[PDB]
Design a binder for this molecule. Structure first.
Ligand SMILES: *[C@@H]1O[C@H](CO[C@@H]2O[C@@H](C)[C@@H](O)[C@@H](O)[C@@H]2O)[C@@H](O[C@@H]2O[C@H](CO)[C@@H](O)[C@H](O)[C@H]2NC(C)=O)[C@H](O)[C@H]1NC(C)=O
Ligand SMILES: *[C@@H]1O[C@H](CO[C@@H]2O[C@@H](C)[C@@H](O)[C@@H](O)[C@@H]2O)[C@@H](O[C@@H]2O[C@H](CO)[C@@H](O)[C@H](O)[C@H]2NC(C)=O)[C@H](O)[C@H]1NC(C)=O
Ligand SMILES: *[C@@H]1O[C@H](CO[C@@H]2O[C@@H](C)[C@@H](O)[C@@H](O)[C@@H]2O)[C@@H](O[C@@H]2O[C@H](CO)[C@@H](O)[C@H](O)[C@H]2NC(C)=O)[C@H](O)[C@H]1NC(C)=O
Ligand SMILES: *[C@@H]1O[C@H](CO[C@@H]2O[C@@H](C)[C@@H](O)[C@@H](O)[C@@H]2O)[C@@H](O[C@@H]2O[C@H](CO)[C@@H](O)[C@H](O)[C@H]2NC(C)=O)[C@H](O)[C@H]1NC(C)=O
Ligand SMILES: *[C@@H]1O[C@H](CO[C@@H]2O[C@@H](C)[C@@H](O)[C@@H](O)[C@@H]2O)[C@@H](O)[C@H](O)[C@H]1NC(C)=O
Ligand SMILES: *[C@@H]1O[C@H](CO[C@@H]2O[C@@H](C)[C@@H](O)[C@@H](O)[C@@H]2O)[C@@H](O)[C@H](O)[C@H]1NC(C)=O
Ligand SMILES: *[C@@H]1O[C@H](CO[C@@H]2O[C@@H](C)[C@@H](O)[C@@H](O)[C@@H]2O)[C@@H](O)[C@H](O)[C@H]1NC(C)=O
Ligand SMILES: *[C@@H]1O[C@H](CO[C@@H]2O[C@@H](C)[C@@H](O)[C@@H](O)[C@@H]2O)[C@@H](O)[C@H](O)[C@H]1NC(C)=O
Ligand code: NAG
Ligand code: NAG
Ligand code: NAG
Ligand code: NAG
Ligand code: CA
Ligand code: CA
Ligand code: CA
Ligand code: CA
Ligand code: CA
Ligand code: CA
Ligand code: CA
Ligand code: CA
Lengths: 388, 388, 388, 388
């Protein structure tokens, strides 16, 4: 009926309250559950959903064998209610996709699903499930996108795509989409920067995206922009380094930190003035553990000092991708934009002795009331019957 | 649209008509059914639902192994339609929780889910699925709540939480909640009393809660209160003792009956003037059997005499927790508050030779027409394939 | 919103067009499907549903073992959409019941579920899922009802219950129900008659019920009545005998035909003037085959001549119970009452080498356009894995 | 509420964007998924659905054995949401059918399901699930229909049925249906032509159907007609031959091309002026591969030259039936009729070493933006556990 306004500011928060846990892998030991990756949450004005990519194989079946291309023609974007195990019996089909994003403008769902060959992949955009536009690769080298929700403000939704090497300079574009039609795009002028798998959120009528530098940055890049795609770029300055892998905390940089800068993990962070909430793994080397850190000057200053840490997953347990999501005033009844996040808990290959790899999910919302750290890990006992 | 009024009196009844039976365990021998505990029913102005806690494991799977903490990070509050087996394919996610309560104010669902560590657990309150408040532990010793429905009157919902020892004096609070926000709380001044797992129901614009004394009472404690949290406390006086374990019926007390007073089972009872409907197990020592007893003076007098008994489950079959639920006039069309109850039929450990423990459920509503006693037990044949 | 009027006459028809087939047993060889009996169809002003009784066990599981009481505390009335396999994942819970009826008045569903002991069983009546009344046994000898839909006319719904011997004279009552409350009942004065498992349908503001004589009739008894429960009784006169078992067709009677009169099968027939559509098995001795016969004088004349036969199930395949259902003008848009019927295809014990017994279903609607006979049998290949 | 107008022209397009992929077979290796054929898509003004025929057997079960009649009494038309694996837990029942069509007029669904014996089969027509008419065989030799969607224009829906030999001259009729009632039919005068399994679509208030000649044509026949059933017939003229099997491309004919003309595969094509979009297999001999070809003069000229080819499935992978579907302006918001297509990917017998045969599906919509060819095959690894 009416577009989400997108004009409120992020809510003042003090900590993170647990929102969901699906136990998808534990349930999938016996039930009929998809093998999934990137279980990103996104919400409308009425409800929240978990989106995910599947190869159309179930846990404990031979088709879950992971020695197959990530970018396969079987890969599909699907969604199910938040907190449920992702099954063929409760999941909706969204798009054929090996890279994706989705977001709700207040009226209907936009989904973006990229499929096709590496040298010519096409993003199919859908609005309320009907194809409304396509974007084809402009460098012929793996067109790819956020793997989390796009950001909507007053009926325009915004996303970021990358095309080019994942181990060197690439090309980055921002897209403005209305009723699933591309109305504007801009190519970033970002020499020496690298953007992948952006987590973008609206805040006071502009978008902020925090991304992954897979080339040569162990801190995270960011790009922010207004409704006309006039943008700014930088890297998060804090010495509390956000990517995985990374060095031990040390002197930061408002450009890419080259030490342990290659590879990465999808991640997010929330800017509050000169301060920043960072979610990151607990290990510097593997996707293990998860913590939220408040660094009151960490957006702009390069020291390694921070003031608050909240435990989310212990370093003895596997974590994985994570991303932002918001809950607008039209859903919550609040006067401010609520920040939330999800974490993927990756099980299986390469770290564990299975034929498959899947994630389960947890999610949290920021609140200004009492909270507590704990560890909420995946909890499945591997290997499974199919691995014997 | 409009809040439940909560101002009517309990319906005059003569007996208990059977309302539901889910056969969850029998079905879960082959189907994909959660291992559950505390299958409490609660209703809105339109429908009733069964809420429950799961560890996110299914029957007949290795993850159902019960030599694990009750208070785990895997534990979740879920709900499904009354009378259906609780499966990942028909259950909705509500909250991450190892102790919970839920209730509908006429407008939306309030859910309360407690997770986190023993020394600092946090109740996450949700209204229509959106986080609206948190309550953190105030004694740092296992914040916990009803495991049945909270009580709503004219848009305010009420619950009771405990924090402190389960084998000695603890601390008890009543909470008043509006649109999922705590608007008032009071700490009971109840020396020598013990409250756990309260069953609370509205009756004539006030709430009555009947609970479990785990310290030193084989009769049940109660607390009643008005909308401003001005309260009264006591224990049910009847010599028809309500808890399990308990002594043989004898002289009662309007304080805790110390004989066989340690441990307990979640239970309920309904006050009608000086009279009381008690639901209890049939065994004095184990959670076996279930019966409803009408004691016309049993709220206030300490004799062991009663006038009506209705069989629910035979003493040769396992029972478990039980709790109250009501059905308001906005749902039923009646001019009075309808009392109902559920019973959990616990199967597996510690009494039986399985690796797991789960409950199925039955429920009954009070009526003023003809009724009959019978035994409606769980009916599964144990052990299961996973226990071999 | 508005009650079904129930004042139209049965549609003129010439034959029977196939309406549904669920293939429940074939699907249940692998899927998670209830063991069921009496899959009766009933419709509202918007949709049709299949109701059924289950013991809360699934096909191919140990709990499906049939050497158990029919009248057990596990037995439940459930419903699912017409034409779907009856699973815990698509079925709704209605009532705890070992004998049942249901019907929709235009506004909400009435369900009637009988449970409890043989010497004191209680029918629980629900309207829109809320308990609205109870009827207790009046002879203390197996209170039981239709196992098919009740009949509704202008907001009053009507049913027939029996209490007493199934091998001798019993007691028969008609009940008039409004918003799930009994407003009137009458006991039939029917010496030497026997009524069980009535199929009742509305026609021109009155109800006609065709039933099973289990005592001493191989033709079917009937009772018809107006809104004030003023009734008439008889037996279908045709020599085309309707029950199973029965003798070969011969001279009929407008009283019970004693030859092969003991035992029976639930069945139906539709009166059109002095003429009758009879559905019956093809075998005189076992529940095998199914056919529809039009006998233009068969309501009132005792000859064995008929004019039309339409094959439904071949005599080489198992049939079972069958019952009427109607589709009112408020659902169909027609100016007349549409007659339909379902058939249960019974598989397993006692005729086949399994531990279990279940039915699948087929259904047909009367039409005045071209039709064709065929055989639409169950089609499962027995025995199943659990029987090995 | 309001009928689809059906008066717009096909959208100008340049290529085909991927719309769905269900991975039904891969998922059905472990989950509970029907064995299916003819997964045709059809849409309303609100949503799209996949319709299909099942024998009521699941993958990996003994009942999936394919040495059984295609025209069995077990065969049923069912439907599920586009892009989901077709399971008993997410599929709706539509009709008992071994040949079918369905379409939505803007108000409700029409379904047409043919069952019964070869010498007298009856199409049961339903509108909003209620039987509204029947059509019986007029040649007593396998009455059969489209196996894809019928075409609706301003409240009248249109379909084509065949009756007679599949290896010689037969009889062909067009039917006009309103609210599920046949209002008009015409028999084609088409000597030497053969029509089976028509794909029909509306375009500018008329219908075009492209079909399969099973007798003696390796090009496809067509019939077009207006709302009064005044018709024209021919064969697609292009030397880019459309059927399977077929000869190598060569000189075409605006009559049947006899070389490799016997047998066939259900297919479609879209007429744009004198030009045509043809979907066909890549192999000339087996149902392998799939491609879309634009031949700018191919409706009317017989040369073998074409200008655009888009890969859909590689020749090393199995394809199967394919059919048209449209998306009207009332669904899309466009000013033109959107052309789409589905393809069935047939796995199992006769080409592969299994006891069963099933299809999965992919679908595509025409767009005027950038697109790309690829191969999106079924992807299951055969044989399955049941075949061992
Ligand atoms: C933030 O925006 C709200 C909502 O703006 C309206 O809805 C949007 C989707 C878009 O359509 C806008 O153009 C609409 O005005 C603002 O609230 C509105 O303010 C206007 C101007 O005073 C007023 O007339 C409306 O009644 C308001 N609507 C509501 C529902 O309150 C709000 O002022 C903006 N806040 C800030 C801080 O920018
Ligand atoms: C019990 O309360 C009912 C309902 O009260 C209304 O709805 C509540 C949720 C709340 O909003 C109240 O403040 C509302 O009045 C009472 O019925 C109402 O009585 C008032 C006063 O006479 C009258 O104006 C309304 O029409 C009534 N509403 C309805 C639907 O009947 C009722 O009187 C109370 N009964 C008792 C015994 O206290
Ligand atoms: C059969 O009954 C219809 C409907 O009657 C109405 O709806 C019923 C549920 C009940 O509420 C009745 O008391 C209602 O009248 C009759 O149609 C109605 O006829 C009346 C009297 O002429 C007229 O005023 C209404 O408009 C009619 N309603 C509709 C929807 O047509 C109809 O006459 C009856 N037919 C026969 C043969 O008895
Ligand atoms: C195509 O048809 C549209 C819609 O026609 C209406 O809806 C149909 C289902 C049917 O009921 C028609 O008889 C209706 O007119 C035409 O648009 C309508 O045009 C009329 C005539 O000018 C106008 O009064 C209406 O407002 C229009 N309705 C809408 C929703 O725009 C349209 O003109 C037709 N287009 C062509 C090219 O034939
Ligand atoms: C897992 O898959 C591996 C290779 O698959 C091989 O590759 C796939 C893509 C197909 O081509 C398959 O037919 C090939 O054999 C195997 O090496 C491995 O054995 C597979 N199975 C396992 C690990 O159990
Ligand atoms: C059931 O679980 C028991 C112990 O689990 C042990 O504890 C759990 C929490 C994990 O740490 C597990 O890896 C440990 O082995 C076992 O003792 C027992 O064998 C388990 N399996 C059974 C009973 O089959
Ligand atoms: C099927 O059930 C039969 C008897 O059950 C016996 O009766 C039931 C009600 C229970 O009391 C059960 O524990 C008893 O053993 C058995 O005789 C029979 O073996 C059962 N199993 C089969 C046929 O596989
Ligand atoms: C598959 O089915 C084949 C024949 O079925 C035979 O035909 C069916 C219709 C039934 O009559 C069945 O009872 C008959 O045996 C068998 O030849 C074949 O063995 C079946 N099983 C397989 C291939 O595993
Ligand atoms: C929001 O978008 C609407 C519709 O395009 C436009 O009229 C309006 O001015 C926008 N509001 C703001 C505050 O930008
Ligand atoms: C019920 O709550 C409303 C809204 O807060 C208040 O105005 C009203 O007086 C309350 N009614 C009663 C009887 O307490
Ligand atoms: C139908 O029932 C209504 C409401 O009780 C009554 O007023 C009306 O007269 C009835 N109509 C007929 C035709 O009996
Ligand atoms: C569409 O059908 C309606 C209702 O039958 C008729 O009045 C109208 O003229 C039709 N419109 C056109 C353009 O044919
Ligand atoms: Ca990096
Ligand atoms: Ca700092
Ligand atoms: Ca105690
Ligand atoms: Ca007493
Ligand atoms: Ca008999
Ligand atoms: Ca006769
Ligand atoms: Ca051909
Ligand atoms: Ca050409």
């Amino acid at each position: 009926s009416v577009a989400l306004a997108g004009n409120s500011s992020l809510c003042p928060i003090s900590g993170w309250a647990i929102y969901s846990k699906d136990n998808g892998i534990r349930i999938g030991s016996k039930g009929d559950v998809f093998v999934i990756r990137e279980p990103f949450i996104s919400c409308s004005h009425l409800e929240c959903r978990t989106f995910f990519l599947t190869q159309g194989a179930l846990l404990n079946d031979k088709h879950s064998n992971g020695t197959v291309k990530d970018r396969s023609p079987y890969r599909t974007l699907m969604s199910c209610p938040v907190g449920e195990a992702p099954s063929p019996y409760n999941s909706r089909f969204e798009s054929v996709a090996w890279s994706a994003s989705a977001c709700h403008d207040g009226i209907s769902w936009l989904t973006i699903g990229i499929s096709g060959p590496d040298n010519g992949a096409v993003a199919v955009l859908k609005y309320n499930g009907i194809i409304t536009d396509t974007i084809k690769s402009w460098r012929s080298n793996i067109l790819r996108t956020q793997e989390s929700e796009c950001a909507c403000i007053n009926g325009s939704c915004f996303t970021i795509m990358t095309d080019g090497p994942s181990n060197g300079q690439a090309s980055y574009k921002i897209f403005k989409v209305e009723k699933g039609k591309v109305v504007k795009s801009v190519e970033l002028n970002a020499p020496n920067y690298h953007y992948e798998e952006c987590s973008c959120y609206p805040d006071a009528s502009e978008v902020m995206c925090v991304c992954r530098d897979n080339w040569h940055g162990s801190n995270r890049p960011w790009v922010s922009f207004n409704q006309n795609l006039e943008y700014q770029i930088g890297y998060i300055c804090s010495g509390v380094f956000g990517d995985n892998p990374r060095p031990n905390d040390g002197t930061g940089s408002c450009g890419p930190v080259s030490s342990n800068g290659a590879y990465g993990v999808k991640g997010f962070s929330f800017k509050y003035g000169n301060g920043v909430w960072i979610g990151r793994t607990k290990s510097t080397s593997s996707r293990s553990g998860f913590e939220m850190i408040w660094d009151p000057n960490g957006w702009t200053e390069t020291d390694s000092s921070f003031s608050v840490k909240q435990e989310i997953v212990a370093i003895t347990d596997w974590s994985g991708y994570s991303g932002s999501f918001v809950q607008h005033p039209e859903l919550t009844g609040l006067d401010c934009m609520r920040p939330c996040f999800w974490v993927e808990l990756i099980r299986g290959r390469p770290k564990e002795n299975t034929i498959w790899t899947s994630g389960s999910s947890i999610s949290f919302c920021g609140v200004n009331s009492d909270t507590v750290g704990w560890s909420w890990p995946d909890g499945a006992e591997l290997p499974f019957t199919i691995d014997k």
